[PDB]
Amino acid sequence: SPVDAATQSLLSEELEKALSKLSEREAMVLKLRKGLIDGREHTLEEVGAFFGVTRERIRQIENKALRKLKYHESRTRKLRDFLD
Amino acid sequence: VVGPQLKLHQCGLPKRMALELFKPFLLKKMEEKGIAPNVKAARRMLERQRDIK
Amino acid sequence: TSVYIEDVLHEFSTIPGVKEDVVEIILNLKELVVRFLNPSLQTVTLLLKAEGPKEVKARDFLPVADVEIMNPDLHIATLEEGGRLNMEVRVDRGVGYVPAEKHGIKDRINAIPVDAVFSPVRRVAFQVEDTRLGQRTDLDKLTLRIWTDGSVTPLEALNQAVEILREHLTYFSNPQ
Amino acid sequence: MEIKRFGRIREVIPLPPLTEIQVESYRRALQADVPPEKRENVGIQAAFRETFPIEELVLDFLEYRLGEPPFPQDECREKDLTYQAPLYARLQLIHKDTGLIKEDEVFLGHIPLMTEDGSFIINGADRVIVSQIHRSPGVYFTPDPARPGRYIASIIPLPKRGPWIDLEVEPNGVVSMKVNKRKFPLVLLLRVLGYDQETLARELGAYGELVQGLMDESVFAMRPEEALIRLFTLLRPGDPPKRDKAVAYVYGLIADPRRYDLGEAGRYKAEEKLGIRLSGRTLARFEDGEFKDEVFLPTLRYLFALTAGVPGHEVDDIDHLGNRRIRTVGELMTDQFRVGLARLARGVRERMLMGSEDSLTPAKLVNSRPLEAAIREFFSRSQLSQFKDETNPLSSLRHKRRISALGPGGLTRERAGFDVRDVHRTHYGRICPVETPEGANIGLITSLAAYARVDELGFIRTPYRRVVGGVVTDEVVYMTATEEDRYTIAQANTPLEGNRIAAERVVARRKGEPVIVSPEEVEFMDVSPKQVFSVNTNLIPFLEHDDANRALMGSNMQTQAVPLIRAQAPVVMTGLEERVVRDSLAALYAEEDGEVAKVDGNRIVVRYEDGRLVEYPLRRFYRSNQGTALDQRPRVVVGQRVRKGDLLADGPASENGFLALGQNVLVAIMPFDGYNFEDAIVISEELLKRDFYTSIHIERYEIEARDTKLGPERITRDIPHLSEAALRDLDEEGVVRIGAEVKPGDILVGRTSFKGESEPTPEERLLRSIFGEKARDVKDTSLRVPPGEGGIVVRTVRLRRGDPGVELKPGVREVVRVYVAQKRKLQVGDKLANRHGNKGVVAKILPVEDMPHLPDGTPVDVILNPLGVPSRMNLGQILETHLGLAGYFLGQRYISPIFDGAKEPEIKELLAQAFEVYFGKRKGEGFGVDKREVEVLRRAEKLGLVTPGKTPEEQLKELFLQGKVVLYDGRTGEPIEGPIVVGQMFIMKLYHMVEDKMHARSTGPYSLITQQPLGGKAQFGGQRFGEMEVWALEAYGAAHTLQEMLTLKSDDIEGRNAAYEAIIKGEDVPEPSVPESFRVLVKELQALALDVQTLDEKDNPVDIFEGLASK
DNA sequence: CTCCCGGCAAATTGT
DNA sequence: TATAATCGAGCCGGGA
RNA sequence: AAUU
DSSP states (O other): OHHHHHHHHHHHHHHHHHHTTSOHHHHHHHHHHHTTTTSSOOOHHHHHHHTTOOHHHHHHHHHHHHHHHHHHHHHHOOSGGGGO | OOOTTSOTTOOOOOHHHHHHHTHHHHHHHHHHSTTSSSHHHHHHHHHSGGGOO | OEEEETTOOSTTOOOTTBSSOHHHHHHHHTTOOEEESSTTOOBOOEEEEEESSOEEEGGGSOOOTTEEESOTTOEEEEBOTTOEEEEEEEOBOOOSEEOHHHHOOOSSTTOEEOOEEOOOEEEEEEEEEEEOOSSOOSEEEEEEEEEEOSSSOHHHHHHHHHHHHHHHHHTTSSOO | OEEEEOOOOOOSSOOOOTTHHHHHHHHHHHOTTSOGGGOOSSHHHHHHHHHOSBOOOEEEEEEEEEOOOSSOHHHHHHHTOOOEEEEEEEEEEEOTTTOOEEEEEEEEEEEEOOOTTSOEEETTEEEEEOEEEEEOSEEEEEEOSSSTTOEEEEEEOSTTSSOOEEEEEOTTSOEEEEETTEEEEHHHHHHHTTOOHHHHHHHHTTSHHHHHHHOOHHHHTSOHHHHHHHHHHHHSTTSOOOHHHHHHHHHHHHTOTTTOOOOHHHHHHHHHHHTOOOSSSSSEEEETTEEEESSHHHHHHHHHHHHTTOTTOOOOOTTSTTSEEEEOHHHHHHHHHHHHHHHHHHHHHHHTTSSOSSSOOHHHHOOOHHHHHHHHHHHHHOSSEEEOOOSSHHHHHHHHTEEESOSTTSOOGGGOOHHHHSOOGGGTTTBOSSOOOSSTTTTTEEEBOTTOEEOTTSOEEEEEEEEETTEEEEEEEEEOHHHHTTSEEEOTTSOEETTEEOOSSEEEEETTEEEEEOGGGOOEEESOGGGGSOTTGGGOTTGGGBOHHHHHHHHHHHTTBOOOTTOBOOSEEOSOHHHHHHHHOOSEEOSSSEEEEEEOSSEEEEEETTSOEEEEEOOOSEEOTTSBEEOOEEOOOTTOEEOTTOEEEEOTTEETTEEOSBEEEEEEESOOTTTTGGGOEEEEHHHHHTTTTOEEEEEEEEEEEEOOTTOOOEEOSOOTTOOHHHHTTBOTTSBBOTTOEEOTTOEEEOEEEEOOSSOSOHHHHHHHHHHTOOOOSEEEOOEEOOTTOOEEEEEEEEEESSSTTOOOSTTEEEEEEEEEEEEEOOOTTOEEEOTTSOEEEEEEEEOGGGSOBOTTSOBOSEEEOTTHHHHHTBOHHHHHHHHHHHHHHHTEEEEOOSSSOOOHHHHHHHHHHHHIIIIIHHHHTTOOOOHHHHHHHHHHHHTTSSOTTSOHHHHHHHHHTTTEEOOBOTTTOOBOSSOEEEEEEEEEEBSOOHHHHOOOOSSOOBOTTTOOBOBSGGGTOBOOOOHHHHHHHHHHTOHHHHHHHHTTTTTOHHHHHHHHHHHHHTOOOOOOOOOHHHHHHHHHHHHTTOOOOEEOTTSOEEOTTTTTTOO
């Protein structure tokens, strides 16, 4: 619907504004894990193979990426209203 | 309904009707005035009738 | 302004042993004329408990200090053998006609807000008759007839009316 | 208070039972309470005898029985069940070869039962079967429009029970017969019946030029067999004319009492017109191996004699109510039963071929599915089975007495001209001339007259009193239209002394034509004026003073009156308002004499003479079809001695047993500051204060939880992402608690649905991930309050799968229903009407101090503009007010019957007595005439209203006798410069309420193929801006406004999305794109193999699909 | 002539 | 998969 | 089937 088209579009734009504020390496891992790239939510082992690191290393940058993401959110209050 | 007091260029329009008909315009104005944080939040406020201030 | 009847969730209910449905009962409570003797008292709460084959009138309300029921003969509910009526009616002081949707006053969860006709004045007419000071003619003799429910007095009404009008004429003082 | 009744007419008979057209018809069809050997051959009984025996083994019908209903009436409505009885039939199978007899009673399905008040319950909803008017079977003779001196004879059977036949005499001189659009010389058929020229020449020869057109030598040269084969080849080309085949086709067309049915009424009309006797309902017989004629020769004989001008032969008026008959509920239903029966017979023969030809009982041979479906089809989808109108008790009473010319076996709306819609003279006393719909259906749907009853043949009869000599008997004869045309019928108001006619000259009718006649010539006399009009029309006092077009609106609008909590009977009644409540069945009465044992809100227990203690439960706040509250209230007290037929409880819209469709209000007739303009109405806020025109309304909300391929929908209090504020009033299970106040947006029933496969978007996965609330499996589908609705929750019904007594449609776990009630105070935009057709919407509500008021301080209730009267010519409302004024002060109500009513002198006498109370009170209380009453009196005497030189009291009385009073403007205090008409009027609040009609939409649902907004308030629809609306924008030259209608505000998808986004960002709306419905048009033309190309100015193709449709 | 196909006001609601 | 079964069941105007 |  016009509302939905507007809402989803605005959401895609705010999500990207927050991911560019992450290093390229730690933003790409989050996109691969939640399916924003390729549509599939990749396992921890697979993300290890594409960046060539250990399954535990990839879990670590996801939490620090997600934690840093959480910090920028508490600061700018940008993504809160899309939770409905 | 007849509205004798109107000037020829006027009509009576129910407030509840106008809120729906002008809803997109209303959302923007609710943001300029601090009445809502942003457009998405403003719409949620109009959804429940008891939430309308 | 509000009514709570025990074991009644809403206005469209009906009470066993009682002839009147709750809608009619509240319709009867709207005729209750309740005088506050103490001018500082803006709200009260009348209690009523009745059972058995009796016709509840306004007298059966439990007497409260500084409060007089001006029409104790008013019919409220007709109860029959085994009928049990226990209620709490909140009475307020106010002005004009404030409908239930407007005030929405509820002392408790199961309370039914009631349309409030606050005004004590039942009828007002005024006669204008011819009179003379014996030199001059077409003078006016003014007679105001004022009927009331008794909570306030026809005279008290007139003074408040005059006092309102006087206070209103003051508003013409500061021009811009 | 006193009830003063007017009128000098003594009505010898009461109104008939008003629902008898319904009640008696179905009882007659079922005969369930009759023991089988004594059932007459009619209705269900006749249907069985027609279908059986089933030949091919022979299966024969013994008897049927109807069981008791599986569920009572209240229960069916609750559970969405049809109220019906099990039908069983005892059948015996015979093997004609063996002699074997196996007999069993087979179950044929269920038959729907009619309730006490004449309605049905079909899947939980109350329905009415509307009687159907149609052409009576029989033999008719009409003039041929093409050739003036010639005529056509038509033999017409019951609908779908045979073909229509036409006997035309062609210009060449031979008598032609037309059947199934094919014509031939009728002579051929005469020879097949076994007629020989000797019989035919001698019989019709008397008519000189005609008998020779019948003579054809070649036809006589062939025996009835050659003539039968010859005819069959004419009617059915390509079918080999096998001798057994022709008998079979022709027999089925004429002699088969199974494939061709004239009415029983058809037989009588035929026997009566041609002066013969029919052995049956067929035009001919198969007897002694050959065909033996019945109808054709008498019909041919009459046709020749009429063309010749033989005395005693007339043309038939096809709109005469003797030749037009009513098909009542029983007959209509039985027809569908017969069809369902014939399909079951087709099933029997096919089962008498397949499987074991030996080992078969009736139970294996009969499949009742065809029968259950035919009846279920009639009740669910027929055009004569209508949703009951039960807005108020009168709504349903009127519905049952309606007569439709439409439906399966009658006209279409595009197929009926003036003749049928006209008021025929024979409608007098039978069908009401006033009560018909305004608009497209005018004259097709009508209403049964009050004293009319439908006889066994289906003709409407109306009562008349015998007059022998000059004495008016008390014996009433119900007459058909045909029989009425014989006598001279005097009017009901003709003066009487005792039983003797007291006038030397009376007003009477001969064939409807008015004529003046001496008492010696009076054969009968009308029973009453009431007998000419419907029940609704009869509720309008002073009807004799109202123009019919307005009385029509008066009738119909009483149907729409909403039951009021304070509802009152009119102060001026017609005397029918008691009977309507009683026959309606809303009110509750005492069976025998007795004593009241108990009185409750929920019940009344009565002790009778019998000693037996009978308990009558009361229907309290039940929701009718239209959402008005049907609620019964107890009118007696414990220990009251009641007689047989005494009132026990008031139904809806009844007051102490009298029909209460509205309130009696004090009305002033005068313009008021333009709030009165063009029929608008001004009301006093005092009406709301005392709760006049307040009505209770209940709306029903429903929700299903069903099994899905994604998992079960669940009704739960657990709804993703919802606050405790939002869930506050929901119980443990997720259902709103009884009594809560619900407003738009509020949750009624909580429900979860499993998120589809394209589950949360990766965008949504990451957003939720940020907040550390991992994404849920289910979504919130809860049922919510629609915009503009809401109220107090009075009921919840929950039906699951696996609880005793309930099984839902496949896949549905549970169904929850929420009943929400509202007390509606009268408001601006609500519609009011009186019984004379004055209708208007409430435009202004004044505080009591602005209302015009009487000198003694009493303010008026309603101000109606006088500009509504003169053009409308409905003056009954004016007389109603005058008598209503008298009654306001005397404290009385009146019964003024239609056409025998209160007359002016009598109203004036009552008004004088009122003035004494209105004025003498004041003079004794120590008040004299007012200064302003003098000023108005001055101006009134300039108007010729008062006589100059009389005392003010005398003049005020002169004005009061004209129904006018001095009126003070509550704003000024100054009088109205002239005396104004004031009195008590009966006014109803109709079912059209702004709350229901107000609607607005920004954006919302769109349609699948067109992508245009859906329609209607219930779908949150957009308004249709149709062709004519586009013309308006075009004529204004508003091109950009119009383009918006065609694109951004409709089916331009890209445009509307972009336009919305711009408005919420504060930008101006963008220029539109291609409407999606044009793309639909293009592709639909491609599907037709037509190439549609949008081209630029260079004639190069433009792709409006933007590459999406090209490889 | 006869027949065969095309037309036959708008918006709204309701089960 | 093998007795034998063999042909169905609304009025109106205008244009070829 | 209603409303205008």
